[PDB]
Subunit: 148 residues, 3 copies
Amino acid sequence: MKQFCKISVWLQQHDPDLLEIINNLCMLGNLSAAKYKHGVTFIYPKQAKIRDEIKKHAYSNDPSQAIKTLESLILPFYIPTPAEFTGEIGSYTGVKLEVEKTEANKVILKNGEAVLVPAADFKPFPDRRLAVWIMESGSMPLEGPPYK
Amino acid sequence: MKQFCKISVWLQQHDPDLLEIINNLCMLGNLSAAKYKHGVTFIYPKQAKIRDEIKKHAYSNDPSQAIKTLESLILPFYIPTPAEFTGEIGSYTGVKLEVEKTEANKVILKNGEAVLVPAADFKPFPDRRLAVWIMESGSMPLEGPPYKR
Amino acid sequence: MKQFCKISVWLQQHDPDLLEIINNLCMLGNLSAAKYKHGVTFIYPKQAKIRDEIKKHAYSNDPSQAIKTLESLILPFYIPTPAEFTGEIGSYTGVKLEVEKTEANKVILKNGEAVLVPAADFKPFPDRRLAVWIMESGSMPLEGPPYKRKK
């Protein structure tokens, strides 16, 4: 597929292992559109270290930290471009995201220096309020003041 | 499986590739029973020509024509026999279907000359309002006056 | 997976064919948590004899007997230990389950002498009201007096 009505379809092509972890943690709903949900923005960790730690925790006898990391990577907002990375937005952790620097096709966040670039091959269908960014380096915030 | 509580289970046995496209185009709901739905009737294109065109469009940079075709093949009505192929019915394109020709076990539609025969191997559960027809030739209406809702 | 947020993940690891049948018979909801549902307790038949019989019926032209057997194996209650195998409980057949005897880690039921031991490798996520027992021998009651269901 080259156009996407669901983020899972893109993830099934880009990292089916991570999609299986998300399904195995009963988190597919976090990733999915819902009527009263502003949107979904998924932050895909480029660097294998973040993903390997998710996998190791996910398949352990306490997958609690894999769940919280995945919550920090999923925003119940539709944020397609650098312009929309403002205001009271954040992940399924309540933590508010703050922009440090913006470029034409890149955002850098405070509180972890997450370097985020839109996934070049993620194009939603025209209704769909879905976005995928690649986190090239840094970490998404785990703790901090909540957005409200 | 030989009696079916879901059309997807029948389709998985005949053309799993097509079911994957339906899933990947977020159209599994169209295919599924619902409280507010008269039923579901699925029109399976027998001719590999139609399905190959669906696959090529679905995996292209614009799957709009795959979506439109799949919508034309899914009726949110329960139409088990030729007798019930009448009235204000049609697909998720909204186009009213008009029968040209009827037989005991076949309907031929106007607006594409769709030739439809009930699938010999699809029998729903007694409490499921599901039907599957096989389109032997022609095409389901894409365009036309809408049925009333 | 070593902790389970849904029973399907556990069953996929032990008998994926059986999970596919439950999906294909539109019984995943029986196996799933729901807001006003006391819980889910799944009885896995250890003996391949019982599971092969479910498989033959499920792939037949009338899978009704596969449905009934699977309904008898799924309880819309959370019963994690022998202590909770009491009261007005039973499977989706509606048949009341009655304990004959309990041990520290086993229950033996009337009406079939079902011998049930909690699955050693099933731990729910904290606060998921899910349980899996292994039926080592006997059969879960198929017919019998109904338990009193909530409204």
